[PDB]
Design an enzyme around this catalytic site. Structure first.
Site, PDB file in Angstrom:
ATOM      1  CG  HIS A  46      -0.533   0.481   2.463  1.00 52.13           C
ATOM      2  ND1 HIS A  46      -0.376  -0.354   3.559  1.00 52.13           N
ATOM      3  CD2 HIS A  46      -0.254   1.733   2.904  1.00 52.13           C
ATOM      4  CE1 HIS A  46       0.027   0.362   4.599  1.00 52.13           C
ATOM      5  NE2 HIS A  46       0.095   1.630   4.229  1.00 52.13           N
ATOM      6  CG  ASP A  97      -0.323  -3.777   2.950  1.00 55.90           C
ATOM      7  OD1 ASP A  97       0.235  -3.377   1.880  1.00 55.90           O
ATOM      8  OD2 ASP A  97      -0.722  -3.023   3.874  1.00 55.90           O
ATOM      9  N   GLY A 196       2.496   6.172   9.010  1.00 50.73           N
ATOM     10  CA  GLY A 196       3.924   6.397   8.737  1.00 50.73           C
ATOM     11  C   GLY A 196       4.800   5.236   9.193  1.00 50.73           C
ATOM     12  CB  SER A 198       2.495   1.613   6.450  1.00 53.66           C
ATOM     13  OG  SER A 198       1.228   1.856   7.105  1.00 53.66           O
TER      14      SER A 198
HETATM   15  C1  LIG Z   1       1.524   4.988   2.348  1.00 50.99           C
HETATM   16  C2  LIG Z   1       0.856   6.212   1.744  1.00 50.99           C
HETATM   17  C3  LIG Z   1       1.520   6.548   0.420  1.00 50.99           C
HETATM   18  O1  LIG Z   1      -0.519   5.918   1.383  1.00 50.99           O
HETATM   19  C4  LIG Z   1      -1.285   5.133   2.208  1.00 50.99           C
HETATM   20  C5  LIG Z   1      -2.272   4.540   1.429  1.00 50.99           C
HETATM   21  C6  LIG Z   1      -3.185   3.674   1.995  1.00 50.99           C
HETATM   22  C7  LIG Z   1      -3.146   3.416   3.351  1.00 50.99           C
HETATM   23  C8  LIG Z   1      -2.179   4.008   4.153  1.00 50.99           C
HETATM   24  N1  LIG Z   1      -2.154   3.730   5.540  1.00 50.99           N
HETATM   25  C9  LIG Z   1      -1.939   4.622   6.521  1.00 50.99           C
HETATM   26  O2  LIG Z   1      -1.801   5.808   6.321  1.00 50.99           O
HETATM   27  C10 LIG Z   1      -1.912   4.097   7.921  1.00 50.99           C
HETATM   28  C11 LIG Z   1      -2.469   4.919   8.892  1.00 50.99           C
HETATM   29  C12 LIG Z   1      -2.494   4.514  10.213  1.00 50.99           C
HETATM   30 CL1  LIG Z   1      -3.193   5.553  11.418  1.00 50.99          CL
HETATM   31  C13 LIG Z   1      -1.947   3.267  10.567  1.00 50.99           C
HETATM   32  O3  LIG Z   1      -1.950   2.784  11.845  1.00 50.99           O
HETATM   33  C14 LIG Z   1      -2.856   1.699  12.124  1.00 50.99           C
HETATM   34  C15 LIG Z   1      -2.391   0.980  13.375  1.00 50.99           C
HETATM   35  N2  LIG Z   1      -2.626   1.784  14.605  1.00 50.99           N
HETATM   36  C16 LIG Z   1      -1.400   2.441   9.590  1.00 50.99           C
HETATM   37 CL2  LIG Z   1      -0.754   0.893  10.026  1.00 50.99          CL
HETATM   38  C17 LIG Z   1      -1.385   2.853   8.263  1.00 50.99           C
HETATM   39  C18 LIG Z   1      -1.257   4.875   3.576  1.00 50.99           C
END
Ligand SMILES: CC(C)Oc1cccc(NC(=O)c2cc(Cl)c(OCCN)c(Cl)c2)c1
Length: 247
Positions: A46, A97, A196, A198
């Protein structure tokens, strides 16, 4: 990372910091990753799916700070960006993912292991730690959900693996969380992965070996009651990793 502690790369030497260059030349942070061999970093699809062009990306190893340099750090471009052909995103859940970035320096070399740059072992097939096991995560993700900027210094924290049975309870994620995913959280909901983080590792000590058990993937909010961090279960993707890390 909500909660947890500031750390430095020597304590997380497999951690890879992944950025994207923009027209105009500005570089922003994208996601974490983990060095699984000298030429290969593993992360989450992702992170890249909307901008799947390998040329756009910069990977750093041996780096502890977001926007400044670390002694012994090494910079790489991406020679091959491999995204999982079956990736998809539902309202909450991301499926398959997982991604691989083949790295290479400007001189055409892969990573050279040092004190601050080291590989992390992959798990073996269907041998994940038992639920209740403590594991660590690392990343440059948000410290608070209301933050709009990332911390300058790498963080880590420790969370406990949650069973699939518990994670699938109605007040948790119900049937949205699958057997190909792992939940982990803090029993008091005080520390968690966040936006962030991820792509970054969830590392468990398994049979005396630091193992890449999961990859930060999704969740509902950060450190919210009954809403664990969700992780790609790396052990379920061994065939896919093995096949793509070839020719
Ligand atoms: C990575 C970016 C270019 O674009 C994205 C596209 C799709 C999904 C995401 N995910 C997130 O931003 C994300 C947000 C949160 Cl708050 C998070 O925490 C969950 C666990 N507490 C996670 Cl793991 C991913 C980004």
């Amino acid at each position: 990372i909500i909660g947890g502690e500031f750390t430095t790369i020597e304590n997380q030497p497999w951690f890879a910091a992944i950025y994207r260059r923009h027209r105009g030349g500005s570089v922003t942070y994208v996601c974490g990753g983990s060095l699984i061999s000298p030429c290969w970093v593993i992360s989450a699809t992702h992170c890249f799916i909307d901008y799947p062009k390998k040329e756009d990306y910069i990977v750093y190893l041996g780096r502890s700070r977001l926007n400044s340099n670390t002694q012994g750090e090494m910079k790489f471009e991406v020679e091959n960006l491999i995204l999982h052909k079956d990736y998809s995103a539902d309202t909450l859940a991301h499926h398959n993912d997982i991604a691989l970035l083949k790295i290479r320096s400007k001189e055409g070399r892969c990573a050279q292991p040092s004190r601050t740059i080291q590989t992390i072992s992959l798990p073996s097939m269907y041998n994940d730690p038992q639920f209740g096991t403590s594991c660590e995560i690392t990343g440059f993700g948000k410290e608070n959900s209301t933050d709009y900027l990332y911390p300058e210094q790498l963080k880590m924290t420790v969370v406990k693996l949650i069973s699939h049975r518990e994670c699938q309870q109605p007040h948790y994620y119900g049937s949205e969380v699958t057997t190909k995913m792992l939940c982990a959280a803090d029993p008091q909901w005080k520390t968690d992965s966040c936006q962030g983080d991820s792509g970054g590792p969830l590392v468990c000590s398994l049979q005396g070996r630091m193992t890449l058990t999961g990859i930060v993937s999704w969740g509902r909010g950060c450190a919210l009651k009954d809403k664990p961090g969700v992780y790609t279960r790396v052990s379920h993707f061994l065939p896919w990793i093995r096949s793509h890390t070839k020719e």
